[PDB]
């Protein structure tokens with residue numbers, strides 16, 4: 001018994017299902033507030049002297065790793081860690097399971113095929129470099145590196161894929177086609193689905209759900225190769241309900257806690273627990289051209305600040 005307060009950074013449906021399922025299982029009064037991973041980091045940091053939640057569930061790992069480095073988290077290694085894909089068992093900058101990995105999300109883009117026809121573009125873009133086509137001017141959205149974890153994952157991915165120089169050259173040539181840098185990582189999926197933009201860049205599972213729900217979207221794992229987020233779970237330093245936060249980490253890393261995300265929580269990420277059944281709509285990492293994402297390097301405060309700063313100077317303001 002007792003209570004649990006969650007800062008959730010997954011989609012609302014996923015958060016609500018996790019909270020409800022956890023409360024039903026353990027008889028713990030559980031609540032959550034949802035913000036993206038970027039805006040959750042900012043709030044946890046701001047509240048450091050009097051923390052307002054017990055656990056941070058979901059959202060890109062980099063800001064969780066950064067919070068770990070900054071002393072905002074409380075280490076706890078669940079026994080369920082042994083079931084997690086080994087390379088994702090303790091992937092953050094500061095080791096000791098201040099953060100753990102609960103899912104994988106593939107970076108890519110999706111194309112609204114109905115709107116594409118209106119643009120007079122015959123071929124569905126298949127490569128990152130296809131997004132620099134002037135015919136796509138004002139027809140692409142991605143989240144804002146200044147605010148969004150998804151957008152940071154994108155920058156870090158490009159830097160690792162092509163080297164930093166080429167990554168920023170790409171951003172420079174993508175930039176003229178971006179109609180809006182969104183505050184939320186998921187807004188480009190919403191907008192692409194509804195035909196308000198033609199191409200959304202973000203994590204493919206979000207576009208996959210919109211597609212299965214009827215949106216005219218073609219998902220693209222870009223031809224050059226791509227990267228991914230890990231979704232994180234982390235207990236906050238100063239958690240008022242520490243035992244329940246640990247139980248929740250166990251749940252988050254468990255076979256049934258992960259399976260429920262797609263079975264009931266309408267969230268189609270790939271699961272990190274090797275004993276869990278995957279959604280038939282989840283991406284299979286073994287089939288994809290993926291970098292080896294260095295969370296130790298990119299999940300650090302200096303590097304995150306540096307790259308975001310460089311983006312503002314070189315892409316937004318240059």
Ligand SMILES: O=P(O)(O)OC[C@@H](O)[C@H]1O[C@](O)(CO)[C@@H](O)[C@@H]1O
Nearest residue numbers: 036037038059060148149150184185
């Ligand atoms: O708004 P930002 O700051 O980008 O944060 C949102 C993301 O961290 C999370 O959003 C999702 O893509 C939702 O399915 C998750 O898979 C992903 O972890």
